[PDB]
Structures are given as structure tokens and as C-alpha cells.
């Protein structure tokens, strides 16, 4: 073409199609194999040669993150949106500390990975988040994907922060009222009690 696609747009495109798993593993301090990572940093020109320090490899990962975020930020914003939604499983025993943070009003939860949400649907889970958006936030609607359909995806850059506004458990008199303002994936199964709580939070 007349123009070349920029490294940051190309990094987002790559991230969205293949890279997202690895990268988020690294960001979230979860296990991951350095071999596919280093290869990634190698083939995408963040390292010209195998790293010789811990700071050298982390420095390159950061550059890689910074390109994905710059390509994300350049997508058109959606100021018409006011809420996005996410379902998640806080009742897994290895997430008790995460659960503890999310269920305390006033607490701020920091997501180290890129945070994925939808403006159209929250898949039924033990917890649903209704995420209120401020003007000018960094979330952006992505293009159609090859691997799913049926809902939009709004992706946020790393280090997005969520303040807990309110916690409404399934036993609360407020539960159905809040639930009737959250679009869910189908909750018409034989198991009527999948959703344990709804949490309103705000992107800071």
C-alpha cells in the first residue's frame, strides 16, 4: 500500500488474534513459558538478541505492552456508552483475596492485564460486574473477531482501576432490581442459583 501499517496498530492486531493469552499471563503474574514469549519479543523486534538480564526482558515486554495500548487508544472512542459488564468466578477458593477486595465498598481493584468487558452482555457467573464509565476513559470497542460473535468487546489498557460502589447479594431485596438492568447470557437453565452477587463498580 501507499502507507505502512504502524507498529502500534499492528501490535494491537496481533494481540487481538494470537498474543493476548501469553501477554496477559505475564502481566497477571501467572505462569507462562518464556520460550514463546522470547520468540514473540524476537520476531516482533523488541529484542534483537536473547535477553541478558531480568530487567532487559521485562523492559521489552513493557515496550510490547506500550505498543498494544497505543494501538488501542487510537481506535475511535464510544462516549455514548455508560455501562459495560463482565461475569466472573469469585467463588473459586484461590481467589479469596480477590473476592475480599471486590466485595468491600470503597475498595479499589487494579487489573494488571488488559481488562475485557462487553457493553451488551454479561455471561452468567457467580459474580456479575456492572461497570460505570467516566468521560474520556481508555476503553475501546474492538473490530469483529474470528473466534466469537454475538456481543461487542470493549477492551481497556493495563492498570485499569475499579472502585467498588455497591455489593448486592442474591439474598438482598435489591438483587432483582439491579439484575433487571444487566443484560445476561441465558440464565434459564435448571440451576436457578448460579448468580451469587452483583457488584456495581466505576472505572477511575
Amino acid at each position: 500500500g501507499s502507507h505502512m501499517i504502524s507498529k502500534a496498530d499492528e501490535a494491537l492486531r496481533y494481540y487481538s488474534a494470537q498474543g493476548y493469552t501469553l501477554l496477559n499471563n505475564y502481566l497477571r503474574d501467572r505462569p507462562y513459558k518464556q520460550r514463546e514469549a522470547i520468540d514473540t519479543l524476537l520476531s516482533r523486534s523488541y529484542l534483537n538478541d536473547e535477553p541478558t538480564s531480568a530487567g532487559e526482558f521485562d523492559k521489552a515486554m513493557k515496550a510490547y505492552v506500550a505498543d498494544v495500548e497505543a494501538g488501542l487508544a487510537k481506535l475511535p472512542a464510544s462516549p455514548e456508552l455508560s455501562f459495560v459488564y463482565r461475569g466472573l468466578a469469585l467463588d473459586k477458593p484461590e481467589l479469596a483475596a480477590l473476592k475480599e477486595q471486590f466485595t468491600g465498598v470503597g475498595n479499589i481493584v487494579v487489573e494488571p492485564g488488559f481488562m475485557s468487558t462487553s457493553p451488551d452482555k454479561a455471561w452468567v457467573n457467580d459474580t456479575l460486574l456492572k461497570i460505570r464509565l467516566p468521560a474520556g476513559h481508555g476503553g475501546r470497542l474492538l473490530g469483529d473477531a474470528a473466534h466469537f460473535k454475538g456481543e461487542a468487546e470493549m477492551l481497556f489498557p493495563t492498570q485499569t482501576r475499579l472502585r467498588v460502589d455497591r455489593v448486592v447479594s442474591s439474598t438482598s431485596g435489591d438483587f432483582d432490581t439491579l439484575l433487571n438492568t444487566i443484560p445476561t447470557s441465558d440464565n434459564a437453565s435448571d440451576n436457578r442459583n448460579r448468580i451469587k452477587r452483583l457488584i456495581e463498580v466505576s472505572v477511575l
Side-chain angles (χ1 to χ4, degrees), residues 15-27:
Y15 172 90
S16 287
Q18 290 197 345
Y20 58 90
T21 326
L22 275 66
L23 191 44
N24 276 306
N25 273 323
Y26 163 79
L27 292 165

Side-chain angles (χ1 to χ4, degrees), residues 83 102-106 128-130 132 163-169 172 174-175 177-179 181 197-202:
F83 298 108
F102 258 118
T103 55
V105 174
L128 312 185
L129 306 184
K130 177 172 189 184
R132 184 186 302 267
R163 191 227 294 121
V164 183
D165 299 322
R166 53 164 172 147
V167 184
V168 180
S169 77
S172 152
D174 294 340
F175 179 81
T177 299
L178 175 54
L179 182 63
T181 73
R197 66 198 62 84
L198 307 174
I199 309 179
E200 296 214 80
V201 305
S202 296

Side-chain angles (χ1 to χ4, degrees), residues 76-123:
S78 299
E80 76 285 6
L81 288 176
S82 42
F83 298 108
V84 298
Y85 305 101
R86 184 168 151 210
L88 69 173
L90 290 182
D91 290 340
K92 292 170 183 164
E94 76 255 29
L95 293 177
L98 181 51
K99 180 178 177 175
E100 203 288 300
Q101 272 268 97
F102 258 118
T103 55
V105 174
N107 291 348
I108 296 175
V109 175
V110 183
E111 165 65 53
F114 288 86
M115 180 181 78
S116 181
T117 66
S118 184
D120 300 319
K121 184 189 301 197
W123 282 79

